[PDB]
Amino acid sequence: MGTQWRGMGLSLMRLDRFRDSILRSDEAVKPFGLKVSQLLLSTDESTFDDIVHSFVSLTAIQIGLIDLLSCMGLRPDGIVGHSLGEVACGYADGCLSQEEAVLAAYWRGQCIKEAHLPPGAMAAVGLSWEECKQRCPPGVVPACHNSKDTVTISGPQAPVFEFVEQLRKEGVFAKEVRTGGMAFHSYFMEAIAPPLLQELKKVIREPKPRSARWLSTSIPEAQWHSSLARTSSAEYNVNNLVSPVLFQEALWHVPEHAVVLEIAPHALLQAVLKRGLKPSCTIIPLMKKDHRDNLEFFLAGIGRLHLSGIDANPNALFPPVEFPAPRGTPLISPLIKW
């Protein structure tokens, strides 16, 4: 979360595949009365202010991007999700269905609102994971282990603000992240677990095993053989919501020279990936916040991908060209140089 911005995805909606995927997601979530397309074309900035709308739109956009990438034939060798979007990771891995993932995200959002818990805020802290975790005041714990340098914590706004100001007193980098006014990955969510799991079981009926490529970021590596990690069951998603995000831990398994694509409406985690990844790795945003033409940025990302040695054919994105070609098409043989 935290990447949604007003007007996101409109540029890419011009593509046939993306619009079709968005329509399918909207149909999937149709019964509840929410239209992802309506949200995307929505003009009010507050449209993404709603947690439900933000979650649904983010999941839909991630699924659409995955569909576009699969259209060209790209087959990921690894998969890593960070807090929300784990469900999108599941859909990419094949263990989940588009309708299943969309419904899961929507139900997560809905149950989140129905909790009506006290306000919760997260602030990014320049302090490392170990020092912050021990230094955390009561009611504040390590929220997400983004990287060695940067760790985020979640808790009641009062102690969170007090510790943020105290840390800023030392000069350590501090910054509050837009949490929608509510905490995550903390004891707070623990209350919401029962109803959320009930809804997911109502939604998830045939859990499928997690693939080898997918690396759970909510299940510590020592437990990756556990019952939870085996299948992307509703319980796994609930734990994903409640448990701390061990994003940094999984990064160490990224092989050298790997090409890392950031499947997201906004390339938020680019800096974290650069800091916490092997220098040989390469990063490609695939989408920029409030960019003039997100389609151009996506095409540039695909081009950079092609420059990286991976094979991707842009023709799949657009409608097929009828053949044979019209007479007068320029000769190609003269253009070849040896």
**Do strands 282-284 and 259-261 pair parallel, antiparallel, or not at all (unpaired)?**
parallel
> Around 117, how many Cα atoms within 13 Å sit in the side-chain half-sphere?
20
First-to-last C-alpha distance (Å) of the chain = 49
- Tell me how far apart the alpha carbons of residues 269 and 284 are, in angstroms, rounded to a whole number: 11
Task: Report the C-alpha gap between 22 and 324 in whole angstroms.
Answer: 33
- Reading the block at residue 101, the tokens are 């993932």
275 is in an annotated binding site: yes
Residue 311 assigned ligand-binding role: no
CB 164 within 8 A of CB 123: yes
Q: In 10 A of CB 43, how many CB atoms?
A: 7
Residues with active-site annotation: 83
Does the annotation place 173 within a ligand binding site?
A: yes
State the CB neighbour count (10 A cutoff) for residue 99: 15
Binding residues for an acyl-CoA: 149-150, 173, 275
